Amino acid sequence: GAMAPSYRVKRMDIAKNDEECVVNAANPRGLPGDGVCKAVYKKWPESFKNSATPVGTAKTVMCGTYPVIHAVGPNFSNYTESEGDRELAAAYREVAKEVTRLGVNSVAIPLLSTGVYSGGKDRLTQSLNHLFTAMDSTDADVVIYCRDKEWEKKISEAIQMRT
Ligand SMILES: [Cl-]
Ligand SMILES: [Cl-]
Ligand SMILES: [Cl-]
Numbered sequence: 001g002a003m004a005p006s007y008r009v010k011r012m013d014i015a016k017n018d019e020e021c022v023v024n025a026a027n028p029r030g031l032p033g034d035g036v037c038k039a040v041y042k043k044w045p046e047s048f049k050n051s052a053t054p055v056g057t058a059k060t061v062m063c064g065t066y067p068v069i070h071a072v073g074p075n076f077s078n079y080t081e082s083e084g085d086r087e088l089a090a091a092y093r094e095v096a097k098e099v100t101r102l103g104v105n106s107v108a109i110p111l112l113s114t115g116v117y118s119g120g121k122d123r124l125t126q127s128l129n130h131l132f133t134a135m136d137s138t139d140a141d142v143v144i145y146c147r148d149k150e151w152e153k154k155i156s157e158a159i160q161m162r163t
Contacts, residue, residue, distance in 0.1 A: 001139030002105050007132075007159045011152040014145040015043035017108035023095050025110045025117075026070035028055055035115045036145075044068050056087035058094035060102065069098045073112030073127075076119030088113050088127060092134035099140050106141040111155075124151055128158055 014022060014036055022044075025036040030052035032041040041048060046061075047068035053059035058071040071094065074087040091112055099107050111127040128144075135142050146152050 002141040005139045005141060007135075007142050007144065009144045009146060009152055009155040009159060011146055011149065013039055013147075014108050014110055015039040017143065017145065019106040019108040019141070019143055020104040021067040021069060021099070021102060021107050023058075023069045023071050023107065023109040024051075025112050025115065026051065026053070026072050028052060028072050030070070036110045040068065056090035056094070058091060058098050060098050067098075067102050067104070069095055069102075069107075071095045071112060073117055075117040076113060076121065076123070077117070084113070084119075085126070089130045089133065092130045096134040096138050099135075099138055104140055106143065108143050108145055109135075110145050124154055125158075128155060132162075 024040040027033045027037060030048050032038055044063035047063040049061060051059055051061050051070045053070060053072055055072050055074050058069050060067050060069045071091045073091045074084040076084045079087065111124065114123050114127050144155055146155060
């Protein structure tokens with residue numbers, strides 16, 4: 001574990017992370033996809049061998065010895081708010097189990113279901129709070145990756161408020 005487990009946020013492409021493993025914002029079919037998923041496919045294509053997994057779950061595939069944890073958040077265009085909320089919380093609980101099993105000291109993570117699976121809604125607080133609920137009991141350093149300048153400021157404020 002990290003000596004003083006922390007949360008940090010960086011505004012940049014998660015394919016350039018400086019952590020021991022990465023979480024992909026995956027689709028259930030293991031396809032290259034869009035956004036974070038397409039960047040992950042270009043950087044670690046070998047990790048898409050048998051990466052298909054259901055909504056609300058995470059499946060890890062190694063690229064060399066580097067773990068890629070494919071986490072499938074719900075597409076809010078298809079789920080109701082209540083069911084989508086439950087599956088989004090579940091995907092993050094599975095990421096915490098995988099990070100613990102892998103024994104890593106750090107993990108790079110995006111906010112699940114905040115891009116094309118958001119159903120056109122701002123889900124920063126919803127997704128980040130489910131991330132904290134799952135990851136708080138782990139001892140890995142967590143680095144959250146985002147692309148928007150206003151989202152970086154809001155995620156940073158949420159992290160600092162709890163310290
Ligand atoms: Cl970048
Ligand atoms: Cl998304
Ligand atoms: Cl973003």
